[PDB]
Design a protein around this ligand. Sequence first.
Ligand SMILES: Cc1cccc(NC(=O)[C@@H]2CCCN2)n1
Ligand SMILES: Cc1cccc(NC(=O)[C@@H]2CCCN2)n1
Lengths: 412, 412
Amino acid sequence: SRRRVVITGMGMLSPLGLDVPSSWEGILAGRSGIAPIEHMDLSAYSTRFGGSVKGFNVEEYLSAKEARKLDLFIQYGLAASFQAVRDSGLEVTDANRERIGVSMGSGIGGLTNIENNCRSLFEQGPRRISPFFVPGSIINMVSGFLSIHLGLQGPNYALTTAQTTGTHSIGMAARNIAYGEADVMVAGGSEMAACGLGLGGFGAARALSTRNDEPTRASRPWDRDRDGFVLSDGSGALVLEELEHARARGARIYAELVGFGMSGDAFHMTAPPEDGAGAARCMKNALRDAGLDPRQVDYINAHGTSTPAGDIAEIAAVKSVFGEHAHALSMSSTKSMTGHLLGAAGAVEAIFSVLALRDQVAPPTINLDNPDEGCDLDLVAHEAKPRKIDVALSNSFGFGGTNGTLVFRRFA
Amino acid sequence: SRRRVVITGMGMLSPLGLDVPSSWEGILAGRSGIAPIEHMDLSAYSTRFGGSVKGFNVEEYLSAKEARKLDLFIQYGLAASFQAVRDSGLEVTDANRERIGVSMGSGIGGLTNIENNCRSLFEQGPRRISPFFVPGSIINMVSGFLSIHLGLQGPNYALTTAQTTGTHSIGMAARNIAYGEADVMVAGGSEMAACGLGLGGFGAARALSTRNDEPTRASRPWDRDRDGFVLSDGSGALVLEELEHARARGARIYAELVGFGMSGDAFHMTAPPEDGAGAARCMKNALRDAGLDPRQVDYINAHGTSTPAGDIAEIAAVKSVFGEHAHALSMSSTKSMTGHLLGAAGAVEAIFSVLALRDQVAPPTINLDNPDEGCDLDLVAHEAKPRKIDVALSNSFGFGGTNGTLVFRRFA
Ligand SMILES: Cc1cccc(NC(=O)[C@@H]2CCCN2)n1
Ligand SMILES: Cc1cccc(NC(=O)[C@@H]2CCCN2)n1
């Protein structure tokens, strides 16, 4: 048997806001966080826009001196992590510190830092490389710095499963708690790949929307005019907690994490299969994990990246999995507003899935002006939709054919 | 309920050889794989040597056309993964493909690749960044590419926990099998951090031995004249398999994985606590996990990095966990011969640990001419020591205060 896992704290940086409530206000209002990228020369680039975090003050969290040692993705992960722990009310003690762990991930990690240290290496040679270059750039330092700051002595690790990182991180954090290895985990992901290499690398694979004339319309999942994903920055963190632990301290419980699905496509390095067979197995795995029939699902936060092959595979996957229930559930892509936070996508979208449960409302897919061939599900086009939501799925599909699904259920 | 997990397959690239048996012969013979580096000009660097993989032919595994798109750490991960799977005798079929997954990790991932594209970006511009830059460089694509080549549709992920990555990857893949998420996992890690940013970045931190004039004597764990770790390249992969699944197909069983511990130090970003408190908490978690009396431990493959603080913290941790039995067990660092493969270190060392059980021999700590203050355990100085080993333990510690312990025993 297995312990139950609830969500008692959430934290976020996104293109829509510097916390969860501001981000969620944007989501429900159908606001875009997408805009031309500033303080950065993108003249030679085919994409000049994306979702930046606007107005982030790291000194609300760290001294200027400690922040100078850390890549932006690490700053963003720590901000979401500190927010979620504060949100939870959790008190770390000598009696529980060994039962509280961290799994914050990243898809791509310290590109901005690697870029600036490369600049120095090429211009001036090795002796201008920062002594903090390695510990300030590696993906496990959000978990590491968070554990050192709060005295957390539980399981300390980091996933990196490209665009599936946030989903996998929350899921395997839930397993740690369910199977009794910890009572509390801080889990999610952070990303800041709006550097030359992120825009250039994804630009070189022709992965990115090039709609520079209208950045707020670039991200249009399931729309017949979509031309690739919109690159976005930020972080999500959740405080996961064993239910009896949460009840005993009188925690506020947002929702219960009932199911976790993983699967490999084993198909292609970057492209999903057209029938969405991997996403189908993953969702089926996640619903089995939860002991739920596909009929009980009301809301799916899609991966919904706005790429030609990706959006259409997810329609295929959902129809395969949910048969005659496929039209009854609502499925939206919050990436229509946020863009694609890569390794952080699954984290902020888990929070949006939890808040859909609290507020009984399906977030919109904005820009869904002309649903494509086969895209005839309830994609919640243009505007938020109030409705009954007992069960919410969050899907992530990433490079290497790596899939993740989280099943959240209302707790009352 | 919790299932048992055994090792049916191993594979390796190291500075000592291009597979496991050739690497293991080097270990037992006290051979150093450390030499001045030849693949770049390091005259501007304070460290000009490391454990390179020598004479690696990727066309023993992949087409030159797919290899050209992949960072060496991925090529190294795939070579070790392919060896381990072949060594297991397992056949992937439609009947089991969904129960076979992969967790191959890395500390730093495609730093060589990212540096090369960074160079193209800064001298030429973004139009010269490879279209393959992202899928050819990010850490999860060892798991990704292995799944695509072999048709593995089980859990597909990667850990990144710096120098602990290999141990965590193995430990967590065993938990996946233990809890019935998979019947087989290919797990371990791979690293190729010998580029400008790698040797420069660790150099900037003053973490590396600067013994350029005698590279084979540089790695001298617990020796009073140790001056930092030696950077080494390679991969380790194991086939982990549910015991009954292995029995049902008549698999050759190297050993049983009975114990896994993780703890965070919550002490410092890069320095271990002098008293080994985090490593002690970690070994105890793992011995408890294995249902063991600590006196059952015969052999420890120490992290043993040849840093001043790390080496002494490990003695302290072993004395505190094993009390007077700390004087009866044998503990050695194969990093004396391989150097430090960072995220692959836990993977090759798990294999050395399993071969110490197969062959009933404790590998030496070479270069241990003058053991330091308090370093008075059986550290198997100079020469392999034949001896009874029923139970072997492999330790890793990492930046972020992240700890891993694996416990193996002989199986009948
Ligand atoms: C591809 C593209 C470019 C510019 C605008 C739009 N969509 C609209 O303007 C929507 C549809 C009709 C009412 N408003 N789509
Ligand atoms: C793409 C690439 C690879 C290796 C080196 C360089 N550039 C140089 O070596 C410098 C630039 C100014 C004069 N030569 N670029």
